[PDB]
Ligand binder design. Structure first.
Ligand SMILES: Nc1ncnc2c1ncn2[C@@H]1O[C@H](COP(=O)(O)OP(=O)(O)O)[C@@H](O)[C@H]1O
Ligand SMILES: [Mg+2]
Length: 764
């Protein structure tokens, strides 16, 4: 296609063909008849009105079924010239099925990205597409969102152009459920900035390879997504004043550290454990005293060890190379396989009660002997200190007799803690390689928090993930719907505050505040006699009937026992409260940690060096640190939509996507663009950029007030004076009018350039 020639082989997946762009205007269409009507098994269906029956209406659906629906509920189709429109704000009719059927029609030819005014909607295709080839990065460079079709490269590029123009730090905030596409879209953003910087060192590649290193240790197969990324990641890319790639920093906010020892059915451990095994690689499995079968490792065997989607034998080589490119030295790279090897043995250690003494001692020794060799420990001191911890009580240490159940837990607590400290060290190792010391002024922070989750055993590790979602949407709701309406009244626009009905602070108050759920877990760590049944009672007495979002559990038949239900923004989640009081503090055996501090292995001695602050406190403070930082940046949202739970491509379930569109607030997010004034410019820059349009309206060199100058200027530009407004400090524009000025600006400049050529011929 001629216009699409710059996008190459990706062009059929970025615009409809030059045939269809014309042929769609030929479609049969009666505006009086083409409507959407509601239906139960599929949220809306296209229909033709058959008759009017006063305040009722009768219609024939697209599937030929007759329907009768009330006239306030039947709702017009968008007319066919708007089919597959690239920026849905410009629809003639905007409503629930309009955004639904437009997204289905773009997805119905695998055009996946779509704009929604100030943000984007990304449906997930479970099929790889050529739309990410590296020549398309060059085709996207420097274009406006009004020119090029919607794509993740366009949003990064628009964010980059805004950075250079307004001199303010950008953030790209990618949001959606588990399985929606947040990780790959983060990778594509990082891919764009890498390839741009590589056309114009090795930093450009290191920031690509910094992902698959972490994806080995931080991602694990769960039923919602085979590559579900169990940690929230915020990548700050740093750029110099010239705009070149300078450096990058990774932050990683929480890890599901209990997955190392506990897995549900249909789930894996972290990928590093299974790709060590599956490649059969003798350079590891002779250094680590492993045997090639996962099923005898008690930490790893439960759940599912293998999946059709992932070829671990190649993924191991990819991540072993990824540590090479990041510069991990060979002894250091081998060393972290040793701990990831030791953790497999560490769960196989058997312990037995002495028959009258009610104290546990090691049933065997060989699996402890393997672990102590890898961790660089004395096996005799390891098993002694594990079964006989010395706890300091002032002047004396008392020795506690561990029963067989609690010594098993103590191994689990140690295994978790080694893994989480090794992972968090690796991020600190990556950041130290990436700090290139190139000159710097601005940053672009790309965020993919762990997506909203509903498993069937919603333990504490899903409250922290679902609370993070509820804050980040409340960041979106604050930015798009409240701050966008505080600015209007502050600048004195003739505006009336609109109640969009999208606000969540009533539910965050149930979690974050000092008598919310995550505050009771901080009080009950102070009491030695607290227990989870007493904790659960303290919740109900404080919150049942004293908040709307806190409800009694709805135990369905089959589903495990659950102890309450929360009304989170995207669904009713039935948490299980067993064991949260240890999970919120998780204390280590102080003596065995003293052995890790005396390990010969330089890594493990570093991991526990300089080992009061709960898991929730450190989380909540870090999360409020994150969203303090984001408020000092201009956010670009990209919404991600999971179209199908079956993971089959192209088929879309209408109720499931409609639930996501509503709770992401996508419909309100477009309405504020059509109602409000999304583009706004300071009068100083308005004089500076746009006086070219009509220089005679305000002659520089003759003084005029910059406000009064703009007021004269726009009146002379033969444009509709209802589309713009004058505030105290800024001019404000309706949705399309900024584009109209840009088009008029380039047209006049081009004419001037032709006059420059013509005068040159004239003087010669
Ligand atoms: N843009 C895309 N192109 C092709 N396949 C995709 C895309 N996005 C998601 N998928 C499919 O869905 C899976 C989940 O994507 P993932 O990167 O794990 O996102 P998330 O971390 O949000 O679950 C991918 O492994 C792939 O199977
Ligand atoms: Mg992810």
């Amino acid at each position: 296609d001629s216009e699409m020639a710059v996008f190459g082989a990706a062009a059929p997946y970025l615009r409809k063909s030059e045939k269809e762009r014309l042929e769609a205007q030929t479609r049969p269409f009666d505006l009086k008849k083409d409507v959407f009507v509601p239906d139960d098994k599929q949220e809306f269906v296209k229909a033709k009105i058959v008759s009017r029956e006063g305040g009722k209406v009768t219609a024939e659906t697209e599937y030929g079924k007759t329907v009768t629906v009330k006239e306030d509920q039947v709702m017009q189709q968008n007319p066919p010239k708007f089919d597959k429109i690239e920026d849905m704000a410009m629809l003639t009719f905007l409503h629930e099925p309009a955004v639904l059927y437009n997204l289905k029609d773009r997805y119905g030819s695998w055009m996946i990205y779509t704009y929604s005014g100030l943000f984007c909607v990304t449906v997930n295709p479970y099929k790889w597409l050529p739309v990410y080839t590296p020549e398309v990065v060059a085709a996207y460079r420097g274009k406006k969102r009004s020119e090029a079709p919607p794509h993740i490269f366009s949003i990064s590029d628009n964010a980059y152009q805004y950075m250079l123009t307004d001199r303010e730090n950008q953030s790209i905030l990618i949001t959606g459920e588990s399985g929606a596409g947040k990780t790959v879209n983060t990778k594509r953003v990082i891919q764009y900035f890498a390839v741009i910087a590589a056309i114009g060192g090795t930093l450009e590649d290191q920031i690509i390879q910094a992902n698959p290193a972490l994806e080995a240790f931080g991602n694990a197969k769960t039923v919602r997504n085979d590559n579900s990324s169990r940690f929230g990641k915020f990548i700050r890319i740093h750029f110099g004043a010239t705009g070149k790639l300078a450096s990058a920093d990774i932050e990683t906010y929480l890890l599901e550290k209990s997955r190392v020892i506990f897995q549900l059915k249909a789930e894996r451990d972290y990928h590093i454990f299974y790709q060590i095994l599956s490649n059969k690689k003798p350079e590891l499995l002779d250094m680590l005293l492993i045997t090639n079968n996962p099923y005898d490792y008690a930490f790893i065997s439960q759940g599912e060890t293998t999946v059709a989607s992932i070829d671990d034998a190649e993924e191991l080589m990819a991540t072993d190379n990824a540590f090479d490119v990041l510069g991990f030295t060979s002894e250091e790279k081998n060393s972290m396989y040793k701990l990831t090897g030791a953790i497999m043995h560490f769960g196989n250690m058997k312990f037995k009660l002495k028959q009258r003494e009610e104290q546990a001692e090691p049933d065997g020794t060989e699996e402890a002997d393997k672990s102590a060799y890898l961790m660089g420990l004395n096996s005799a001191d390891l098993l002694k200190g594990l079964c006989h911890p010395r706890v300091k009580v002032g002047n004396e240490y008392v020795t506690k007799g561990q029963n067989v159940q609690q010594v098993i837990y103590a191994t689990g607590a140690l295994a978790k803690a080694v893994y989480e400290r090794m992972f968090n060290w690796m991020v600190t190792r990556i950041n130290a390689t990436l700090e290139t010391k190139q000159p710097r002024q601005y940053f672009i922070g790309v965020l993919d928090i762990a997506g909203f989750e509903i498993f069937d055993f919603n333990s504490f590790e899903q409250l922290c993930i679902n609370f993070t979602n509820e804050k980040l949407q409340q960041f979106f709701n604050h930015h798009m719907f409240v701050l966008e309406q505080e600015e209007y009244k502050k600048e004195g626009i003739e505006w009336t505050f609109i109640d969009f009905g999208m606000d969540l602070q009533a539910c965050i108050d149930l979690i974050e505040k000092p008598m919310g759920i995550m505050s009771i877990l901080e009080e009950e760590c102070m009491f030695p006699k607290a227990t989870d049944m007493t904790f659960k009672a303290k919740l109900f007495d404080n919150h049942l009937g004293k908040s709307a979002n806190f409800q009694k559990p709805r135990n369905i038949k089959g589903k495990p026992e659950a102890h309450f239900s929360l009304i989170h923004y995207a669904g009713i989640v039935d948490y299980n409260i067993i064991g949260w009081l240890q999970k919120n503090k998780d204390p280590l055996n102080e003596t065995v940690v003293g052995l890790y501090q005396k390990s010969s292995l330089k890594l493990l001695s570093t991991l526990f060096a300089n080992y009061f602050q709960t898991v929730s406190a450190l989380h909540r403070e870090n999360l409020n640190k994150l969203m303090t930082n984001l408020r000092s940046t201009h956010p670009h949202f990209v919404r991600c939509i999971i179209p199908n739970e079956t993971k089959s491509p192209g088929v879309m379930d209408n109720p499931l996507v409609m639930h996501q569109l509503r709770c992401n607030g996508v419909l309100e997010g477009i309405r504020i663009c059509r109602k409000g004034f999304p583009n706004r410019i300071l009068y100083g820059d308005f004089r500076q950029r746009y006086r070219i349009l009509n220089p005679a309206a305000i002659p520089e060199g003759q003084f005029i007030d910059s406000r009064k100058g703009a007021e004269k200027l726009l009146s002379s530009l033969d444009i509709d004076h209802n589309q713009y407004k004058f505030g105290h400090t800024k001019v404000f524009f309706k949705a399309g009018l900024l584009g109209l000025l840009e088009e008029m600006r380039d047209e006049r400049l081009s004419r001037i350039i032709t006059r420059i050529q013509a005068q040159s011929r004239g003087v010669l």
